[PDB]
Amino acid sequence: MKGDKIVIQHLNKILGNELIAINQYFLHARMYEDWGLEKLGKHEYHESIDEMKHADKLIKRILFLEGLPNLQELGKLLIGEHTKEMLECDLKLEQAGLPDLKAAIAYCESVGDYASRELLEDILESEEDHIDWLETQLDLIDKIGLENYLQSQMD
Amino acid sequence: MKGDKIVIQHLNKILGNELIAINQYFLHARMYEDWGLEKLGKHEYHESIDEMKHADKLIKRILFLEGLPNLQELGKLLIGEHTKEMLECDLKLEQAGLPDLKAAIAYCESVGDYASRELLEDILESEEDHIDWLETQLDLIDKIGLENYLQSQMD
Amino acid sequence: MKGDKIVIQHLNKILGNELIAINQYFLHARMYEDWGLEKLGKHEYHESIDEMKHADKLIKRILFLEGLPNLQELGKLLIGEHTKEMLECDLKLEQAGLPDLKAAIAYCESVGDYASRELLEDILESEEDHIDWLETQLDLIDKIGLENYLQSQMD
Amino acid sequence: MKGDKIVIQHLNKILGNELIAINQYFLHARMYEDWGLEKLGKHEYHESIDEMKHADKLIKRILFLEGLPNLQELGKLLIGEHTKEMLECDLKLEQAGLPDLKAAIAYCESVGDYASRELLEDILESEEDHIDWLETQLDLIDKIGLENYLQSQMD
Amino acid sequence: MKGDKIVIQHLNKILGNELIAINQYFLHARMYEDWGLEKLGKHEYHESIDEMKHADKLIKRILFLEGLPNLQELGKLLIGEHTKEMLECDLKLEQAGLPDLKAAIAYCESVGDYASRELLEDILESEEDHIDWLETQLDLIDKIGLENYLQSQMD
Amino acid sequence: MKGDKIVIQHLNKILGNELIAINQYFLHARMYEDWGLEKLGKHEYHESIDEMKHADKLIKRILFLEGLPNLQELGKLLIGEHTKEMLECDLKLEQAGLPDLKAAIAYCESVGDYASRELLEDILESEEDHIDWLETQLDLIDKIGLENYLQSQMD
Amino acid sequence: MKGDKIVIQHLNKILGNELIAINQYFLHARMYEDWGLEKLGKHEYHESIDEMKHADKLIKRILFLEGLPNLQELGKLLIGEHTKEMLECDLKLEQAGLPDLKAAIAYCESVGDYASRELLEDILESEEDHIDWLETQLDLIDKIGLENYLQSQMD
Ligand code: HEM
Ligand code: HEM
Ligand code: HEM
Ligand SMILES: [Fe+2]
Ligand SMILES: [Fe+2]
Ligand SMILES: [Fe+2]
Ligand SMILES: [Fe+2]
Ligand SMILES: [Fe+2]
Ligand SMILES: [Fe+2]
Ligand SMILES: [Fe+2]
Ligand SMILES: [Fe+2]
Ligand SMILES: [Fe+2]
Ligand SMILES: [Fe+2]
Ligand SMILES: [Fe+2]
Ligand SMILES: [Fe+2]
Ligand SMILES: [Fe+2]
Ligand SMILES: [Fe+2]
Ligand SMILES: [Fe+2]
Ligand SMILES: [Mg+2]
Ligand SMILES: [Mg+2]
Ligand SMILES: [Mg+2]
Ligand SMILES: [Mg+2]
Ligand SMILES: [Mg+2]
Ligand SMILES: [Mg+2]
Ligand SMILES: [Mg+2]
Ligand SMILES: [Mg+2]
Ligand SMILES: [Mg+2]
């Protein structure tokens, strides 16, 4: 079904952000795992798989609207070197993506592409959950201390 | 069956206390939950459903005694900002209420409303348990330390 | 994540509404239960837990948006003395509440707080169903008569 | 297998009636359920489904006989405003059809379409059961009074 | 609950379209099955049912909104003579109604009937799925040839 | 019980028809089976066991009516050499028999042998089904092509 | 454990190749599925999930050898517009990656990094299966024909 050209661009924009979140979280995930931070690793891993599913939904939607998904452009990944940093990189990421999503949702409303809007709304709801977990981890670190926090993430 | 007017005034009195407890603990529960303090949040949550059961019992008792339950008044809520403060507020709350319960059990005895006395006695035994747990946490905080005590409340 | 101050203000207001419903429906529930009107008390009981869930969702959303939930203020409960009056009071409360829900959804739209909009929409759809049942009963009372209606509610 | 032009003409006619029954009963079913008359609702709902299986039987027989089903035209639709009237309108229709079926069975006999006859015969027996139930409901209203009948159709 | 006259007017309009879908899909389904194309028949049969659930949702909304469902008027019916055309007539219908759903959701939003909106919203997502399947069948006919496509729809 | 002499002559008549069908379909079945046309062979096989059941019914009916079943005469067998021919032969066979069945049902009616009429009516309804399937295959052959139609009959 | 700088450069290179395939196979996969070619889509999907696992194995190896996995560089994706081209694009990828794996294995052998060589041999064996499958589908297309091949890929 022929979709809106500008709507397809927003979708590709959102898709671009997702592909980045995918590699960054996967790498981070395997890093925690490599440090012996199993709990932290398993959670970062799922965050990765979620982003993969977001990418999947977007791709399918774009194909349905008769557009061309763009998996060719990979933006700058924000890799960290230590836990507190990695958390803050994922946070910067998730945040930087909110303006694009709300701008995409707002555009779909304006052109009557309500299904795409519901799609982006779901993903959005999911992005706010990640942002929440992340903030919580950072607060937890300041509350119980890096040593205790990292001990809690082993196994 | 028409009950003693003063006994019902007492019941409504204690009822207002519980209603406060309900709100205070539910907010504290969602706050812990929100800070990622799983354990604390779960306990405070139950303490809350507990107070609801207490309120429920009094309501029924009042209704039976042919009085009018007062779910209209809600006293000051002692909301803490950080864990130790929140625990102290709940303890202070559970203690300011005991005198009233005892003054009520004492009264039922004086006018022979033995059944209402058994109701309060039960609510009472629970209250000394809510207080027991609370006092325990406060002492743990001083024995293992806040950071350690918080850490252990995470999962 | 810091949310819109006006959105949180809206949310907090709706929270007060729910808290009112909880108490009103709970009293009505125990009253029906107290008159031997099992069916009615059972339903009213559920309508009450429903409102408790609503309140819980708003609280959590408010906390996430980093605001202070208000379990403190409690509005005027509309208590009835007889079945028909009790149904009216509840319908009245559920209706004098919609304008606020809609004014809030509309607001979230204006500031792009789409996730809060979804929260409100859900409880909104639930509210129209509470209103449906209520109206359904009121009309029923006039179709089969009060005596028959009450009889039906006993068992 | 080419069948008699006139036999198919009857089949087509019978079919229009079913399509009418379908919509009419479907509307009464939702109306009943909208008023809170579960018992009446479910029955009208199933009767609606019954009429759907009837139409389905005809469409197939017609297609097989190499004719063109006319799902296009829909005749008058006796919609009622109250139970009593809705029950009567459903009985008028359920009767205004009998002749057609009876008339169609006689026709099939005269031209040797025995298979079409037995098929109609079946819808015919079923229709006499839609009528028995309807006439019974109306009589019941007399024997126990409207408000009583309704009270029975609630749950 | 009294709803907006214009919103109920849209709902009523949307409802007519579904009733058409129901009949057109049901006829095609029997035709397919009559020719021996089981797969095609089974799918049209399901799409026929889907449309019935759509119409049922509207009817309830309309009744709840205190309007009068119009099961009476039935729009024209795009009947096809062969698969290729039958598939096209069904795609046209699904597209000649998509705008209405879009036009209705926009209306509900402008007058605050958020509940009706989410209801149309769903039928809408579903209809984009009916359309995706139809477009796919047509494209498949191209890529593999009518004879192969039909051969694959047999068993 | 002594039956009508003409009714029995009819029964024996139709009986001879079935016996032919039995042989024709069994040979056609083993021929398909032999050509590796699994599906066709299986269907033709059942159509054959069917005709056996028909013959069985008539035999019993004749025996009851106190007549002598004639399994002695066997008419011309229409054996095809290739698929389409075989289908046409079976169709031609199933059609030359219908007039006789109808002429027999008609006769039973005239002499009041209603039970024998029900027997024929059933055999009749099956016959229009054997014809339905056969006509379907012939049309499929012309829609997807012989090679394609044969291919699909292999497994 | 510190690994050989060049072994790591090789590992990073293979990783880059895997990362390309992931996206190419995932886009091709959703494309087949968007066209209704379920068989093909499901296969490409799995081959894509395979590359993901491959990349995962390398990421881990690299982290263990204390190097920095590079998920930032993304080579040129070869995306086709129709099945045959898409199959040829993936085959080209696999082939263009074979030299690099063999080069890497050979280097690990020259510096005593046997565990890294073992890992690579495994991925190598997996890559020859993808190739065998791709070459086979292309041959299958020549033996039976695009129309038939595509039909076979439908379900
Ligand atoms: C007049 C005050 C209230 C009364 C009498 C009341 C009573 C109850 C009762 C008896 C239950 C059943 C619990 C069980 O035994 O499993 C319940 C459940 C619950 N209450 Fe309350 N409640 C009150 C206020 C509140 C408030 C203000 C909140 C939130 C701030 C709340 C939130 C809940 C929740 C979430 C549940 C669990 C519901 C579920 O089972 O899914 N309640 N309440
Ligand atoms: C236009 C108004 C119609 C409405 C509102 C309606 C509604 C429904 C609903 C809600 C169901 C049950 C769906 C499920 O749970 O699976 C149903 C089933 C069905 N409908 Fe309709 N329908 C309509 C018209 C028709 C017509 C005109 C036909 C035939 C031409 C038809 C034939 C059927 C059949 C065969 C079933 C399945 C029955 C069974 O499984 O026992 N419907 N319909
Ligand atoms: C174009 C980007 C990618 C897309 C669209 C994608 C999509 C997916 C999807 C749909 C799944 C299934 C999710 C589930 O049901 O659990 C999956 C699984 C997985 N992905 Fe990705 N993925 C991508 C990139 C990656 C990358 C870059 C890696 C690793 C560096 C990766 C590693 C994995 C793993 C390990 C699994 C699960 C494997 C298993 O099933 O055992 N993915 N991916
Ligand atoms: Fe995401
Ligand atoms: Fe995210
Ligand atoms: Fe510790
Ligand atoms: Fe208590
Ligand atoms: Fe307590
Ligand atoms: Fe509510
Ligand atoms: Fe409510
Ligand atoms: Fe009927
Ligand atoms: Fe009927
Ligand atoms: Fe629809
Ligand atoms: Fe549709
Ligand atoms: Fe036979
Ligand atoms: Fe036969
Ligand atoms: Fe690979
Ligand atoms: Fe590969
Ligand atoms: Mg939504
Ligand atoms: Mg926070
Ligand atoms: Mg009493
Ligand atoms: Mg035919
Ligand atoms: Mg008969
Ligand atoms: Mg109503
Ligand atoms: Mg398409
Ligand atoms: Mg004998
Ligand atoms: Mg290490």
Short mmCIF file of C-alpha atoms in Angstrom, two decimals, chain D residues 78-134:
data_model
loop_
_atom_site.label_atom_id
_atom_site.label_comp_id
_atom_site.label_asym_id
_atom_site.label_seq_id
_atom_site.Cartn_x
_atom_site.Cartn_y
_atom_site.Cartn_z
CA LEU D 78 -38.96 -5.01 11.24
CA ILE D 79 -36.98 -3.42 14.05
CA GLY D 80 -38.82 -3.17 17.37
CA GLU D 81 -38.50 -0.69 20.22
CA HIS D 82 -39.28 -2.88 23.24
CA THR D 83 -38.97 -6.59 24.09
CA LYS D 84 -42.65 -7.25 23.55
CA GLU D 85 -42.53 -5.63 20.10
CA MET D 86 -39.14 -7.09 19.17
CA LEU D 87 -40.49 -10.54 19.99
CA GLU D 88 -43.57 -9.89 17.84
CA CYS D 89 -41.60 -8.52 14.88
CA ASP D 90 -39.37 -11.60 15.00
CA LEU D 91 -42.51 -13.74 14.94
CA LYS D 92 -44.12 -11.88 12.05
CA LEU D 93 -40.99 -12.37 9.92
CA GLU D 94 -40.50 -15.97 11.03
CA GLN D 95 -44.07 -16.59 9.82
CA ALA D 96 -44.14 -14.41 6.68
CA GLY D 97 -41.47 -16.80 5.46
CA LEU D 98 -43.23 -20.13 6.05
CA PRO D 99 -45.42 -19.68 2.98
CA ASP D 100 -42.40 -19.05 0.75
CA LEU D 101 -40.65 -22.19 2.01
CA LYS D 102 -43.87 -24.21 1.81
CA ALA D 103 -44.44 -22.73 -1.65
CA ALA D 104 -40.86 -23.57 -2.66
CA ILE D 105 -41.07 -27.17 -1.45
CA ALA D 106 -44.25 -27.69 -3.47
CA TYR D 107 -42.48 -26.25 -6.52
CA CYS D 108 -39.42 -28.45 -6.16
CA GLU D 109 -41.76 -31.45 -5.98
CA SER D 110 -43.56 -30.48 -9.16
CA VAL D 111 -40.33 -30.22 -11.15
CA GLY D 112 -38.41 -33.11 -9.62
CA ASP D 113 -35.78 -31.19 -7.61
CA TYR D 114 -36.04 -33.57 -4.68
CA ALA D 115 -32.64 -32.62 -3.26
CA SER D 116 -33.54 -28.93 -3.13
CA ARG D 117 -36.78 -30.01 -1.49
CA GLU D 118 -35.13 -31.90 1.37
CA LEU D 119 -32.79 -28.99 1.86
CA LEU D 120 -35.73 -26.60 2.17
CA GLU D 121 -37.57 -29.15 4.28
CA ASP D 122 -34.77 -28.86 6.85
CA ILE D 123 -34.77 -25.06 7.01
CA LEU D 124 -38.56 -25.45 7.34
CA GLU D 125 -38.43 -27.64 10.44
CA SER D 126 -35.93 -25.26 11.98
CA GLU D 127 -38.16 -22.25 11.26
CA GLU D 128 -41.05 -23.93 13.08
CA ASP D 129 -38.72 -24.06 16.12
CA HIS D 130 -37.81 -20.38 15.85
CA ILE D 131 -41.55 -19.78 15.94
CA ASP D 132 -42.37 -22.15 18.80
CA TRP D 133 -39.82 -20.36 20.97
CA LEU D 134 -41.14 -16.95 19.97
#
